[PDB]
């Protein structure tokens, strides 16, 4: 009972966030569809939303049929498969579970003994470090009775009651992955393709020269203080040649970082012109 990847389809995730974020500050809850496998890849396909009365700290499913009236409305297309789990959201508070979550999760497992919860935290979920996580409860009955196989990977060092409570009753916390294919990543990245116009637009010059003979003005003052900064520099210690001069705007770099830059964006401005010249 380990090494359980949880692949997710990218069509599933971003629906989890959007409805998982539009309801902010009040939290939010929906469902997952997928299919168990023998033990390891408990994949996921697609999700949806039960209606609900959301607060900042609590929510339930009001209606008990919109999840049942819709699967029966889906199989006419059969674009998905049966149910496998359910998610919810803690909007700014960290990723963990609560005594309410288990009481409902404790139904699913005895109903079906691999179902899964999922937790998300969109506020602190910046364009980088997502914090999503999922969970499968344990049998503490089986605990008092009293598993790794040659690989474990990743563990957490935060979420206190996911870190000191995250084992004794929460769940055999379990990694995730993503099923990013070629067939979709193509249609995925089609945003950043700028345009076929977007590499020969010789934009206006009236900032260019206003940057050019502006930039050199900003070169000298750092240069001629680096002219100061080589006076003898053999003074009172080898470290005294280093630590008497803190890195408060180390000069020589600062000119090089703009030396290359003004070169790199002007060389395009000149080249782009002569190419645009042969538009005719």
């Amino acid at each position: 009972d380990t090494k359980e990847t949880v692949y997710i389809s990218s069509i599933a995730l971003l629906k989890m966030l959007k409805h998982g974020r539009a309801g902010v500050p009040m939290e939010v809850m929906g469902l997952m569809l997928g299919e168990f496998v023998d033990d390891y890849t408990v994949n996921v396909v697609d999700v949806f939303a039960m209606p609900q009365s959301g607060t900042g700290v609590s929510v339930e499913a009001v209606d008990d049929v919109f999840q049942a009236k819709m699967m029966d409305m889906l199989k006419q297309t059969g674009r998905d498969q049966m149910v496998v789990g359910w998610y919810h959201s803690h909007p700014g508070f960290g990723c963990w579970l609560s005594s309410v979550d288990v009481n409902t999760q404790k139904s699913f497992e005895q109903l079906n003994s691999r179902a899964v919860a999922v937790v998300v935290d969109p506020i602190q979920s910046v364009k980088g470090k997502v914090v999503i996580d999922a969970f499968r409860l344990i049998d503490t009955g089986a605990l008092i009775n009293n598993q790794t196989t040659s690989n474990t990977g990743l563990l957490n060092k935060a979420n206190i009651q996911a870190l000191i409570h995250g084992l004794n009753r929460h769940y055999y916390s379990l990694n995730i992955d993503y099923h990013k294919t070629a067939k979709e990543t193509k249609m995925l990245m089609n945003l950043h393709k700028e345009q076929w116009q977007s590499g020969l637009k010789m934009y206006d010059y009236e900032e260019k020269e206003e940057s050019n003979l502006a930039a050199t003005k900003s070169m000298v003052k750092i240069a001629e203080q680096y002219s100061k900064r080589i006076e003898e520099e053999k003074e009172l210690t080898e470290e005294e040649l280093k630590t008497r001069y803190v890195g408060r705007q180390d000069p020589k770099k600062h000119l090089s970082e703009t030396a290359d830059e003004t070169l790199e964006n002007n060389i395009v401005s000149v080249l782009t012109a002569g190419v645009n010249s042969v538009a005719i």
Partner: protein
């Protein structure tokens, strides 16, 4: 350079304790220790200057700076 973008939160420098860490008593009311980032001056901070912070971390980001007599000897 991303986090240096919005939405920041204000404060008020007090004093340093190390080459790469200082403290703040923000306007929100409380006092917090916090680490300055590099790519930043140091010469301009020691008094109760004005500052800008990153909200959730309560980190530090960047600096921010800011009768008429009309007569003459004729």
């Amino acid at each position: 350079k991303r986090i240096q973008s919005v939405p920041l939160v204000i404060g008020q420098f007090l004093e340093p304790i190390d080459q790469n860490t200082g403290i703040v008593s923000s306007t929100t009311g409380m006092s917090y220790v916090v680490r300055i980032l590099s790519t930043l001056d140091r010469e301009l901070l020691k008094p109760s200057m004005s500052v800008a912070l990153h909200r959730h971390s309560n980190a530090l980001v960047d600096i921010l700076p800011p009768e008429k007599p009309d007569v003459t000897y004729a």
